[PDB]
Amino acid sequence: QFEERHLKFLQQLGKGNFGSVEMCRYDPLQDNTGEVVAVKKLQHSTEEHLRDFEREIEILKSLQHDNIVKYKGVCYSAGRRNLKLIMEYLPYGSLRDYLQKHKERIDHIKLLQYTSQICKGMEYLGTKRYIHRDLATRNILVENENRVKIGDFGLTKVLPQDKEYYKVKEPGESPIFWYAPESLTESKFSVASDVWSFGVVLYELFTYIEKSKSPPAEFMRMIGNDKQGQMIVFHLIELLKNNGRLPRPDGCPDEIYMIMTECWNNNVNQRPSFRDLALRVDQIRDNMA
Numbered sequence: 001q002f003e004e005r006h007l008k009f010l011q012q013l014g015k016g017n018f019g020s021v022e023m024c025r026y027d028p029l030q031d032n033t034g035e036v037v038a039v040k041k042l043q044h045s046t047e048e049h050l051r052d053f054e055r056e057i058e059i060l061k062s063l064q065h066d067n068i069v070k071y072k073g074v075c076y077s078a079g080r081r082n083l084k085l086i087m088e089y090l091p092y093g094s095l096r097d098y099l100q101k102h103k104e105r106i107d108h109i110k111l112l113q114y115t116s117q118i119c120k121g122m123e124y125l126g127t128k129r130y131i132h133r134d135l136a137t138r139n140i141l142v143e144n145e146n147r148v149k150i151g152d153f154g155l156t157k158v159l160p161q162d163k164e165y166y167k168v169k170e171p172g173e174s175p176i177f178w179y180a181p182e183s184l185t186e187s188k189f190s191v192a193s194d195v196w197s198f199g200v201v202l203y204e205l206f207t208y209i210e211k212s213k214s215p216p217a218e219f220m221r222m223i224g225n226d227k228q229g230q231m232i233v234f235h236l237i238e239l240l241k242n243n244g245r246l247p248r249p250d251g252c253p254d255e256i257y258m259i260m261t262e263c264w265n266n267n268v269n270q271r272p273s274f275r276d277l278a279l280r281v282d283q284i285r286d287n288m289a
């Protein structure tokens with residue numbers, strides 16, 4: 001589909017784990033008429049990561065939604081190595097950086113517009129029995145001032161056809177400050193744990209990515225910055241077990257923070273669905289307008 005001899009590297013957009021995303025121009029005619037695309041590749045083409053990356057490509061290719069980053073194709077060299085994922089390029093970057101830049105022009109109604117778009121994108125994943133796991137403002141991309149998209153699926157897993165959860169323990173850094181408690185203790189990931197993580201995403205939006213108010217900062221100040229390594233996740237477990245939650249962001253209405261706290265239910269079954277979340281957000285957004 002996309003030949004590597006026509007992918008012109010422009011700049012690197014982001015580097016997480018275990019791959020990176022590059023801004024490239026696919027210009028096969030060699031006349032600056034091609035489009036700028038986003039190319040995701042691996043940093044170490046191991047067989048374990050290559051198998052996960054191929055399943056990630058199939059997941060994204062199976063997704064067609066206004067709030068999901070569009071899949072365009074793949075690219076590979078001689079063989080199955082150097083495999084790359086070709087996606088659409090969204091100009092305004094991640095919602096984490098975009099909100100932090102225009103924080104003086106993005107009111108609460110605009111935050112609820114992005115919130116509904118995230119819920120409708122997550123609910124579409126739930127119909128496919130996909131568990132995103134890694135939902136955060138760093139993963140939500142901005143196409144323009146009126147549309148955001150879920151921009152990465154490197155941790156997304158398909159649920160077993162007979163279970164509603166998915167147990168997985170991946171070696172490496174885990175965003176434990178977005179994870180549901182059952183994901184920290186039992187490595188259990190479900191649609192309900194995505195609801196917990198969405199509540200953290202809702203917390204991020206209303207903090208406007210103030211670095212002192214970040215979920216890791218607030219959680220670490222609650223358990224004490226003196227905690228060390230494994231004792232960090234253990235005190236976070238004990239804190240969440242005792243209804244220790246992130247504070248209400250500055251200027252956040254009471255009803256918006258309730259959505260966060262209700263998503264932050266220790267009882268996995270008592271967390272609301274994304275369709276109910278979209279309803280309550282659209283209901284508040286209409287009452288504001």
Ligand SMILES: Cc1cnc(Nc2cc(F)c(C3CCN(C)CC3)c(F)c2)nc1Nc1ccc(F)c(NS(=O)(=O)C(C)(C)C)c1
Nearest residue numbers: 013014015016017021038087088089090091093138139152
């Ligand atoms: C699939 C995709 C499509 N379009 C874009 N557009 C975009 C991304 C930018 F960053 C930026 C800038 C770059 C410079 N600085 C200052 C920030 C803003 C920009 F102008 C446009 N980006 C994508 N991917 C992507 C990229 C970079 C990440 F950091 C992440 N984050 S990530 O998913 O968690 C992962 C890397 C997988 C761990 C995803």
